[PDB]
Amino acid sequence: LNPLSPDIWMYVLLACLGVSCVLFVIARFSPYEWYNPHPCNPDSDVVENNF
Protein backbone atom coordinates (compact mmCIF):
# COMPACT_ATOMS: atom_id res chain seq x y z
CA LEU A 1 0.00 0.00 0.00
CA ASN A 2 3.07 2.30 0.23
CA PRO A 3 3.90 3.02 -3.53
CA LEU A 4 1.25 5.72 -3.44
CA SER A 5 1.42 8.20 -0.57
CA PRO A 6 -1.50 7.99 1.91
CA ASP A 7 -3.08 11.16 0.55
CA ILE A 8 -3.19 9.68 -2.99
CA TRP A 9 -5.10 6.66 -1.68
CA MET A 10 -7.68 9.16 -0.42
CA TYR A 11 -7.75 11.32 -3.56
CA VAL A 12 -8.42 8.30 -5.78
CA LEU A 13 -11.23 7.27 -3.44
CA LEU A 14 -12.71 10.76 -3.57
CA ALA A 15 -12.34 10.49 -7.34
CA CYS A 16 -14.43 7.31 -7.42
CA LEU A 17 -17.17 9.12 -5.50
CA GLY A 18 -16.52 12.19 -7.64
CA VAL A 19 -16.88 10.48 -11.02
CA SER A 20 -19.67 8.06 -10.07
CA CYS A 21 -21.73 11.02 -8.82
CA VAL A 22 -21.11 13.01 -12.00
CA LEU A 23 -21.66 10.00 -14.25
CA PHE A 24 -25.00 9.59 -12.46
CA VAL A 25 -26.03 13.18 -13.19
CA ILE A 26 -24.93 13.23 -16.84
CA ALA A 27 -26.46 9.84 -17.72
CA ARG A 28 -29.83 11.01 -16.47
CA PHE A 29 -29.65 14.54 -17.94
CA SER A 30 -28.52 13.38 -21.38
CA PRO A 31 -31.54 12.32 -23.47
CA TYR A 32 -29.50 9.77 -25.43
CA GLU A 33 -28.77 7.38 -22.55
CA TRP A 34 -32.54 7.10 -22.02
CA TYR A 35 -32.74 4.07 -24.31
CA ASN A 36 -35.88 2.18 -25.02
CA PRO A 37 -36.17 -1.33 -23.54
CA HIS A 38 -38.34 -4.06 -25.14
CA PRO A 39 -36.56 -4.00 -28.54
CA CYS A 40 -39.10 -6.23 -30.31
CA ASN A 41 -42.13 -4.74 -28.54
CA PRO A 42 -43.60 -1.42 -29.79
CA ASP A 43 -44.46 1.84 -28.02
CA SER A 44 -46.23 3.52 -25.03
CA ASP A 45 -42.80 4.95 -24.22
CA VAL A 46 -41.45 3.02 -21.20
CA VAL A 47 -37.87 4.25 -21.77
CA GLU A 48 -35.51 3.80 -18.81
CA ASN A 49 -31.95 4.30 -17.61
CA ASN A 50 -29.54 1.57 -16.49
CA PHE A 51 -27.29 4.11 -14.74
Partner: peptide, 16 residues
Protein backbone atom coordinates in the same frame (compact mmCIF):
# COMPACT_ATOMS: atom_id res chain seq x y z
CA UNK B 1 -40.16 22.20 -24.58
CA UNK B 2 -36.89 21.94 -22.64
CA UNK B 3 -38.92 22.44 -19.45
CA UNK B 4 -40.87 19.31 -20.43
CA UNK B 5 -37.62 17.34 -20.22
CA UNK B 6 -36.32 19.18 -17.12
CA UNK B 7 -39.11 17.44 -15.21
CA UNK B 8 -38.72 14.23 -17.23
CA UNK B 9 -35.11 13.67 -16.13
CA UNK B 10 -36.22 13.81 -12.49
CA UNK B 11 -38.37 10.70 -11.97
CA UNK B 12 -35.84 8.92 -9.71
CA UNK B 13 -37.26 5.40 -9.65
CA UNK B 14 -37.48 5.20 -13.45
CA UNK B 15 -39.49 3.23 -16.07
CA UNK B 16 -40.69 6.69 -17.21
Amino acid sequence: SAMVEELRMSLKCQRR
